[PDB]
Every structure is written in structure tokens, then in C-alpha cells.
Amino acid sequence: VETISFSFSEFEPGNDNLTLQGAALITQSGVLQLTKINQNGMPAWDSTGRTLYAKPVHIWDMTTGTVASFETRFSFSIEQPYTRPLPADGLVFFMGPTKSKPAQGYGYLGIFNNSKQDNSYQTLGVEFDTFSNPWDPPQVPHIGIDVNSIRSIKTQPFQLDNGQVANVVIKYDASSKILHAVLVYPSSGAIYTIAEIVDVKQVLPEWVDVGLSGATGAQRDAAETHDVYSWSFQASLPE
Amino acid sequence: VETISFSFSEFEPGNDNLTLQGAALITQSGVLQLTKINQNGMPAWDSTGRTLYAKPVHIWDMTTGTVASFETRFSFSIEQPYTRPLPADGLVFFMGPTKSKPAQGYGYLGIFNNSKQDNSYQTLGVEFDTFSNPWDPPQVPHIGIDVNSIRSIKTQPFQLDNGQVANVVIKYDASSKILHAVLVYPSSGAIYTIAEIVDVKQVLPEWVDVGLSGATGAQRDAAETHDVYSWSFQASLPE
């Protein structure tokens, strides 16, 4: 049984277990800021940043047909300082081909290049979307399960508790093919749940990189923070 | 679309929207005590109690083949005062045939008569089991999804935060047939999740009673409290 796991209770600047891309940065206080924060302390628009674990994960094997079960937990906060324009764009936990670089920002969240359902993306993602694009349901923010497309196969609206810490748990059970996610805000006690059937063998390559990506808007001040405080992950490929 | 819903932020003694069975009682403080509490304030063993919503729920229709999606949320606390003997037995949210009366107590939780997988039970339940019976996994307590049997088709161990309030969310998506449940302890921030595929048409009758049931042990002092503070439910049969 191939098992892989990591747990960051906080982030250490300079650690070589995380690959920072784009605007992503680890502060001296141990916070992972996915998108840029200006010197005035305000979030910058037109910013895209990602953080990928430095080791690829064996998610499934063609030879045996076995598929791994996995679970990831992370805490983040989104702070929206301006009344107008509308804040954007969101953050997303994703799994895709190894050695990947940032894709298009804005509503594509740094992981897609367009709004098409393309099998060549080979990407699975759980988004926390803050801006309603034309391919989005009118309600924002919302949790969404993305399978080879920014056009989610399932969405769940949630109320943002501005600047408060949210706890996320995402679990994938290989035997049932159920991807289930939960978002909890300790501040208000709010609990949101979403689940859908996803056969990862039809989406992802055998080996994948796991990461977090965030993006701010295409127009001046259409922005918000995308700060991550902790992140853990475990995967077990049965054998 | 046939929709039904109810929300009890607290329980009112004497309300006629709830059918109390066995030991179940609503206190002056607004708490639903599923199992008996002695005059000394300690939980009594050999106690079984249930509470059913007074109106039956239309879960599916044979004529159209349509199935309802539903969600229930409730808060409860289990307090285990004795070091020995081991506490028992647990509580469970369930759906089954209308006009039902309490079944066997103890490890059967007031909803089953034996440990067999019998289609005649026509019962679906999400248990919070505190005692390991021979049909149980060794880890207790645990959340379990019960389909026509006390022998869960899926279990998830959890750590009890003695006497603290736990929040539960159970959701069933008819389109995907996924039953997903979440348990959160605000006191410690612990989050537990469990999900499984359940086609209710193969289990439940068209109309069902929804309720909560609790039970204490078969031997002296093998007991604990099973207090419920709030309970809400919504179901929508597509049409």
C-alpha cells in the first residue's frame, strides 16, 4: 500500500516541501498568502498564486486498476474590503498533471485556460468561488466540484463570514467514488456540505501534483485576500 | 413539488407536533431527553426512548419513480459519568414505516429486533454508537449508516467530547443517491464526515415517519445521557 502524507500546522518561509508559483508567498507570521497584498495592506487585483506539494502523488494504477482514497484539510480566510467593485475571484484545491505551471487567472482560478469541458485538462478541483462568471450559478460565494472544467458539475452556495477562518475537509472514498467536502466557520457555527460521484480514473493521470491556487479580479480593486493557515493531506493506494 | 419542513430551535413541553415514545421526555428547560435521567441526575440503564415527527413524509412515488432529497440538522450531547462498566448504547436518526412503535433497545437502538439484514425492516438510519457489540467495529464511538440492519454498511470512528454539544448535518441528494453526514464539535473544532450511496427506493416505503431514538445499556450503570437541543428537517419530492 503506497501511502503519502504531510501536515503543515503553519507555514515556514524557505521550506523546500512547497513549490510557490506566481504571487504566492509565505509570511514571517507563517501565513500562506496565495494572492498579493500591497504595502498598504490591501489585496491587489490581477494577482494569481499557487502552492503545490513538492512530491507527486500516486492516485491510481493502470496495471492493477486500483485507486487511492484521500483526505485533505485546510483553513483559510477571505477578506473583502471594498463595497465596489464586486470582489473576485476565489481559491481552489486541485489535483492535476505533474510539473504544471499556472494557467489563466481571474475566473479560471489559475487552473483552466477557458470555460470548456476538456479531457486534456486532467484536473479535479474543489473551488470556493467568490465572483459569478457567465458559467456560474448566480449565487456567490459557492463551493463547486470541478471536473475537467471551470463549469462545476455540482455547486453549493455559502455565506462568507468576512475575514473569519473557515475549516475545510475534503474526502474521497475510492470504493464508492464519492468526493465529499465540508466547510465550517467556527465563528458562526455554520456548516456546509457537498458531495458528488467522481471516478478519478476517468479524469486524472496516474501521478498528480496536489495544490492550492487563488486569483483576484480583472479590473481595479476587484480583489480580496486568499490566506491559508494550515494544510494537511493523506493518500493511500490499496495493495 | 411536495415539500415538508419543520424546525425546533428548542423543544416545548406539551407540543403536539412530536410523538414521544418510551422514556423520551421534554424538560421545562426545553431539552429533549431521549433516555431516562434519575432523580439523582444520573442517566438510567435499561432505558429506550424515541421522538417521531407527527406527520408522515412522502419520500418517493412508485407511479412517477421520483425520489425526494432531504436534509436534517440536530444538536445533541452525550455525557458518560461512570468509568465502569462501559457506557452504552447510543442514539440514531431514522426513517421507517409509519405508525411504528419502539423495537428492541440496547445495541439495537430501539429500531431493530435482531442483527439480521432484513428487507422487511424498511429502515434507514444514521447512528452515533457508543458501545461495541459483536456486529460492531472495535472503535467506539462511531457514526454508522444503517440500511435495513444494525450492521452498518459504513462506519466512521469519532472521539466523544464528553458532555459537549455536537452539531449534526445529514443530507440526501436524490439525483446522485448520496447520503452524506457531518458531525462537528464546536468545543474542540473537530470535524467528522461520512458518505455512502443509498438508493432509498430499494429500502424505504413511499411514506415514512422520521425520528430520533436513543437507548442505554443492558446491565447496571451501563448508561449515558442522550439529550437533543434542536432539530430541523426539510424534504422536497420533485414534480
Ligand SMILES: *[C@@H]1O[C@H](CO)[C@@H](O[C@@H]2O[C@H](CO)[C@@H](O[C@@H]3O[C@H](CO[C@H]4O[C@H](CO)[C@@H](O)[C@H](O)[C@@H]4O)[C@@H](O)[C@H](O[C@H]4O[C@H](CO)[C@@H](O)[C@H](O)[C@@H]4O)[C@@H]3O[C@@H]3OC[C@@H](O)[C@H](O)[C@H]3O)[C@H](O)[C@H]2NC(C)=O)[C@H](O[C@@H]2O[C@@H](C)[C@@H](O)[C@@H](O)[C@@H]2O)[C@H]1NC(C)=O
Ligand atoms: C520536508 O523537507 C525535509 C527536508 O528536505 C524532508 O526531509 C528530508 O527527507 C529526505 C527524503 O526525501 C531525506 O533524504 C535522505 O537523507 C539521508 C541523509 O540524511 C539523513 O541522515 C544523515 C546522516 O547520514 C543525517 O545527518 C540527516 O540529518 C538525516 O537524518 C540520505 O542518506 C538519504 O539517501 C538515501 O536515499 C536516497 C533516495 O533513495 C538515495 O538517493 C541515496 O543514495 C540513499 O540511498 C536521503 O537523501 C536524499 O536523497 C535524495 C537526494 O535528492 C537528496 O538530496 C538527499 O538528501 C532527508 O534526510 C530529510 N532531511 C531531514 C533534515 O530530515 C521532509 O521529508 C519528510 O521527512 C523525512 C525524514 C522522510 O521521512 C520523508 O519521507 C518525509 O516526507 C519534508 N517533509 C514533507 C512532509 O515533505
Ligand SMILES: *[C@@H]1O[C@H](CO)[C@@H](O[C@@H]2O[C@H](CO)[C@@H](O[C@@H]3O[C@H](CO[C@H]4O[C@H](CO)[C@@H](O)[C@H](O)[C@@H]4O)[C@@H](O)[C@H](O[C@H]4O[C@H](CO)[C@@H](O)[C@H](O)[C@@H]4O)[C@@H]3O[C@@H]3OC[C@@H](O)[C@H](O)[C@H]3O)[C@H](O)[C@H]2NC(C)=O)[C@H](O[C@@H]2O[C@@H](C)[C@@H](O)[C@@H](O)[C@@H]2O)[C@H]1NC(C)=O
Ligand atoms: C405545530 O402544531 C401546530 C398546532 O397543531 C400546527 O398548527 C396548526 O396547523 C393546522 C394544520 O394541520 C391548522 O389547521 C387548520 O386550522 C384552521 C382553523 O385554524 C386557523 O383559523 C382559525 C380561524 O378560522 C384561527 O382561529 C386559528 O388560529 C387558525 O389560524 C382550519 O380552518 C383548517 O381546516 C381546514 O383544513 C382541514 C384539513 O384539510 C379540513 O379538515 C377542514 O375541513 C378545513 O378545510 C385546519 O384545521 C385542522 O383540520 C384538521 C383537523 O384534524 C384539525 O383538528 C384542525 O385543526 C391549525 O390552524 C394550526 N394551528 C395553529 C394554532 O396555528 C403547526 O403546523 C404548522 O403551521 C400551520 C399554521 C400550518 O402551516 C401547517 O402546515 C404547519 O405544519 C405545527 N408545526 C409543525 C412544524 O408541525
Ligand SMILES: OC[C@H]1O[C@H](O)[C@H](O)[C@@H](O)[C@H]1O
Ligand atoms: O470584475 C472582475 C471580473 O472581471 C472579469 O469579469 C473576469 O472574467 C471575472 O473573473 C472577474 O475577475
Ligand SMILES: OC[C@H]1O[C@H](O)[C@H](O)[C@@H](O)[C@H]1O
Ligand atoms: O453492558 C452493556 C451492553 O450489554 C449487552 O452487551 C448489550 O447487548 C449491549 O448493547 C450493551 O447494552
Ligand SMILES: [Ca+2]
Ligand atoms: Ca467564478
Ligand SMILES: [Ca+2]
Ligand atoms: Ca453498538
Ligand SMILES: [Mn+2]
Ligand atoms: Mn464557480
Ligand SMILES: [Mn+2]
Ligand atoms: Mn454500530
